[PDB]
Design an enzyme around this catalytic site. Sequence first.
Site, PDB file in Angstrom:
ATOM      1  N   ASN B 185     -33.130   6.207  34.017  1.00 44.84           N
ATOM      2  CA  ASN B 185     -33.440   6.411  35.438  1.00 44.84           C
ATOM      3  C   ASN B 185     -33.464   5.105  36.243  1.00 44.84           C
ATOM      4  O   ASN B 185     -33.889   5.116  37.390  1.00 44.84           O
ATOM      5  CB  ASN B 185     -34.766   7.166  35.604  1.00 44.84           C
ATOM      6  CG  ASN B 185     -34.864   8.412  34.760  1.00 44.84           C
ATOM      7  OD1 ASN B 185     -35.835   8.613  34.018  1.00 44.84           O
ATOM      8  ND2 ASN B 185     -33.845   9.266  34.830  1.00 44.84           N
ATOM      9  N   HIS B 187     -35.302   2.442  35.789  1.00 41.90           N
ATOM     10  CA  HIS B 187     -36.640   1.854  35.855  1.00 41.90           C
ATOM     11  C   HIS B 187     -36.817   0.924  34.660  1.00 41.90           C
ATOM     12  O   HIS B 187     -36.236   1.185  33.607  1.00 41.90           O
ATOM     13  CB  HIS B 187     -37.710   2.954  35.779  1.00 41.90           C
ATOM     14  CG  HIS B 187     -37.716   3.865  36.963  1.00 41.90           C
ATOM     15  ND1 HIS B 187     -38.605   3.699  37.994  1.00 41.90           N
ATOM     16  CD2 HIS B 187     -36.919   4.920  37.242  1.00 41.90           C
ATOM     17  CE1 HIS B 187     -38.317   4.646  38.874  1.00 41.90           C
ATOM     18  NE2 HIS B 187     -37.305   5.400  38.466  1.00 41.90           N
ATOM     19  N   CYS B 222     -42.569  -2.970  37.635  1.00 44.01           N
ATOM     20  CA  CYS B 222     -41.737  -4.115  38.000  1.00 44.01           C
ATOM     21  C   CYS B 222     -40.361  -3.572  38.381  1.00 44.01           C
ATOM     22  O   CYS B 222     -39.756  -2.834  37.609  1.00 44.01           O
ATOM     23  CB  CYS B 222     -41.652  -5.127  36.856  1.00 44.01           C
ATOM     24  SG  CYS B 222     -40.405  -6.436  37.078  1.00 44.01           S
TER      25      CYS B 222
END
Lengths: 263, 264
Positions: B185, B187, B222
Amino acid sequence: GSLTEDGLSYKEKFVVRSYEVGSNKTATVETIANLLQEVGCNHAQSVGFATTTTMRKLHLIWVTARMHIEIYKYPAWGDVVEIETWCQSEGRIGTRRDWILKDSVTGEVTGRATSKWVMMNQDTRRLQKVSDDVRDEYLVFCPQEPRLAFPEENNRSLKKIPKLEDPAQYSMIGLKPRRADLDMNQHVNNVTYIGWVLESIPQEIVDTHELQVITLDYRRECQQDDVVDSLTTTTSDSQFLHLLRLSGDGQEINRGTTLWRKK
Amino acid sequence: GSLTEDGLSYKEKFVVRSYEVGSNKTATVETIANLLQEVGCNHAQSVGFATTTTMRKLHLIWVTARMHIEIYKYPAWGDVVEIETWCQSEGRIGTRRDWILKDSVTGEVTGRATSKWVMMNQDTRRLQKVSDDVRDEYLVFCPQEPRLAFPEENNRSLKKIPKLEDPAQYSMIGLKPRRADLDMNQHVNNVTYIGWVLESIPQEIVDTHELQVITLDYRRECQQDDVVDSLTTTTSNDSQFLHLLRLSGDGQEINRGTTLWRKK
Ligand SMILES: CS(=O)(=O)NC1CCCC1
Ligand SMILES: CS(=O)(=O)NC1CCCC1
């Protein structure tokens, strides 16, 4: 996995993991490159190895000089991929390891790879030709007739790679290896360089194209305390010319080319 | 792998790979953490999931708030490790996923892990309590009686973690994620934070000690274009450290943690 019936090649099956896939839910080229590395290690262990008995006392190792990978279809998350690997003597120049990737369900070739290895003194880092004493120790584990994953006369795996001229079109600077990037001998894993080369490819290209071919020349090793700059320039399907060099002095560590296809 | 006979837990066997081991020729804590993540994913797929039908409608996801891992023996290169995983409802606070690591040959427990998950809106990043509609959809896949990987009354998985005070004793500056650090995804993978936390531990400690316990609190995510600073301070035969990950610029906290190491 296991050696084939003739004991001249090794096969292994892998199920693609959740953390091994990218935004398209298929294995990354770095996952593929790690799997080739793993099947290569299992082939050496299955026949008692790589370093032969003569290489060990002489402080000699096989080091990668060139890597060439061509992927037609990236395996999906949860899919089983079968990889067949074998080695071949290239006279006194060095050795070659080839791979064939196949879908376990259909049996079709979904990818292929070839790599050139050269003998080097572990301590002085000096290259050398393969001696007869060393050659006889590994030839009994190789096919004697040629068996090439890339047979084509004058193909992408044997093409000369030019040096990228400054200014680069794209760049990713300040790249540093972490402990996960190191192998069991505390050296930067060869797959990390593939990742670093790909960091300077713009995200838009990654989002609309799939990586079909990657060719990498390994000139120098990156130490744990070194910092790398990744440089890319479009030379064209999309083609790029790549260069990895030390952030400080600008010393070359790698050069390469990638070919991408529109999704 | 496969669900157990009662269908209330999942087991999977893994052979430790060449590129998955460190200097001692045993699996790294990041390899272990990736394997726990993979077995958790296979458990959710095997029962039809880990967003429920109601969670997908309301743009809700399970996010990790805390991770706790204790390793007694790191599996060697070529060894087979068996991991058993299960989930438990923690009322309206959220969910918990526990793991048990065993040696396939001896059958002995070589490690164990626990993690706290909380419901969050994917877009606004706002936390929320577990509703009854959501709870009923996943309870039928969980043991009803408590089943804890860390049962102890004064265990280290529920201890409060303080914020590291500046100046830090050790630090690793300018850490950036690459594409291999991202999940499907886009991330940053939760295992990357474990690696970043460990980067500020001096190499001498890594060379003479083995990591026994790691506890990590996840405060903020992050982004792909963010830069992190890793800070460590010794707080202690055994060595203890207090950790902190924060954004290189503004100094915004992303993680805090503790590690315990033992002499080899
Ligand atoms: C056939 S093998 O790859 O397992 N062994 C090596 C061949 C080159 C040197 C050792
Ligand atoms: C069986 S499971 O691990 O998929 N259960 C989960 C609990 C939280 C939502 C799904």
